[PDB]
Amino acid sequence: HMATLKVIGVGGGGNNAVNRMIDHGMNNVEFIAINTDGQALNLSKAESKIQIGEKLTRGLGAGANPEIGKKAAEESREQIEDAIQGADMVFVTSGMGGGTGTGAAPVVAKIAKEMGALTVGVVTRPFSFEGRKRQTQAAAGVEAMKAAVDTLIVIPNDRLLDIVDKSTPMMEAFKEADNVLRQGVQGISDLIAVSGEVNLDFADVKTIMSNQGSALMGIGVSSGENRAVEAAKKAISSPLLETSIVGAQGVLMNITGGESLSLFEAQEAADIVQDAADEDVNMIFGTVINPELQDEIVVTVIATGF
Ligand SMILES: Nc1nc2c(ncn2[C@@H]2O[C@H](COP(=O)(O)OP(=O)(O)O)[C@@H](O)[C@H]2O)c(=O)[nH]1
Ligand SMILES: [K+]
Numbered sequence: 247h248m249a250t251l252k253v254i255g256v257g258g259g260g261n262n263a264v265n266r267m268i269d270h271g272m273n274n275v276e277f278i279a280i281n282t283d284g285q286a287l288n289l290s291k292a293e294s295k296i297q298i299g300e301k302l303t304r305g306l307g308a309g310a311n312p313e314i315g316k317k318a319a320e321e322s323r324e325q326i327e328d329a330i331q332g333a334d335m336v337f338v339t340s341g342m343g344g345g346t347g348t349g350a351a352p353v354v355a356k357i358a359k360e361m362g363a364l365t366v367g368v369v370t371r372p373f374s375f376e377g378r379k380r381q382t383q384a385a386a387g388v389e390a391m392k393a394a395v396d397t398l399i400v401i402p403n404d405r406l407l408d409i410v411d412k413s414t415p416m417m418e419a420f421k422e423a424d425n426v427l428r429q430g431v432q433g434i435s436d437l438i439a440v441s442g443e444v445n446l447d448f449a450d451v452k453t454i455m456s457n458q459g460s461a462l463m464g465i466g467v468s469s470g471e472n473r474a475v476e477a478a479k480k481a482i483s484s485p486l487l488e489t490s491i492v493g494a495q496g497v498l499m500n501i502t503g504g505e506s507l508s509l510f511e512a513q514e515a516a517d518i519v520q521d522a523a524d525e526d527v528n529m530i531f532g533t534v535i536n537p538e539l540q541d542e543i544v545v546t547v548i549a550t551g552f
Contacts, residue, residue: 259341308345
């Protein structure tokens with residue numbers, strides 16, 4: 247069984263993350279671009295491009311009207327179903343607040359879930375300087391996303407203001423937000439790709455993300471002494487997340503290292519995750535021994551059950 251992963255960007259921000267992720271390099275992952283704006287769709291790097299609402303918008307965007315984005319997605323449902331067909335897992339990424347992403351993303355996610363695919367949502371909330379009316383429209387879209395996905399990850403754009411200095415280019419900040427989705431997809435792709443000493447597969451991912459709600463996906467790489475503890479702290483500690491690790495009652499943790507991987511340091515990483523959750527976590531533990539890795543360790547964490 248080779249799992250089919252698809253990343254679908256809905257709207258301007260979602261299709262921007264898709265384009266940037268394609269530049270960074272992402273194989274075995276098929277990309278789908280959905281948008282009402284034909285101008286931006288023509289500039290997409292994705293192999294599957296779907297233009298919605300051409301009759302409602304005449305090629306333009308939703309003009310901040312979520313109703314238009316929702317109607318455009320439903321009118322093009324069969325075109326979305328065809329592009330998704332065959333996918334075992336789908337990542338719907340979109341920026342909430344606008345018309346297309348706010349109204350179309352929940353429709354694309356509902357279609358994916360009804361297509362029988364594991365549907366994960368990675369959406370952003372608008373900056374506070376964009377106004378309160380846009381934060382309210384984004385909340386409705388977030389609530390609509392949570393009802394149509396198996397698992398949801400919200401990234402408030404204000405958190406970007408915490409990881410930047412006064413000169414950080416805006417594009418460099420957006421790339422930090424893109425890492426949440428990209429590395430979460432790569433971690434899942436790597437898990438299904440290699441057979442581990444303590445093996446986890448796509449069935450484990452389904453059991454941890456199926457019909458849960460909020461979730462956290464993080465990866466952490468470290469070296470030297472205390473690498474296990476430091477890697478685990480990086481995988482669960484992200485300043486861009488609305489849903490933290492605290493309160494998680496279900497975790498899928500995979501530690502990847504060389505032949506030096508110690509049982510003692512594996513328990514350290516697990517304890518770090520459970521202690522940080524401050525809950526009695528139902529954990530699914532896996533271990534992969536990559537002899538190429540020298541003194542570096544990788545901790546992948548998928549946390550749900552909030
Ligand atoms: N982090 C991030 N947020 C974005 C990006 N592009 C747009 N957004 C956010 O997404 C919201 C909706 O914008 P957009 O997706 O382009 O509108 P739409 O195409 O009509 O859905 C905006 O309020 C932005 O705050 C991006 O590249 N990165
Ligand atoms: K595996």
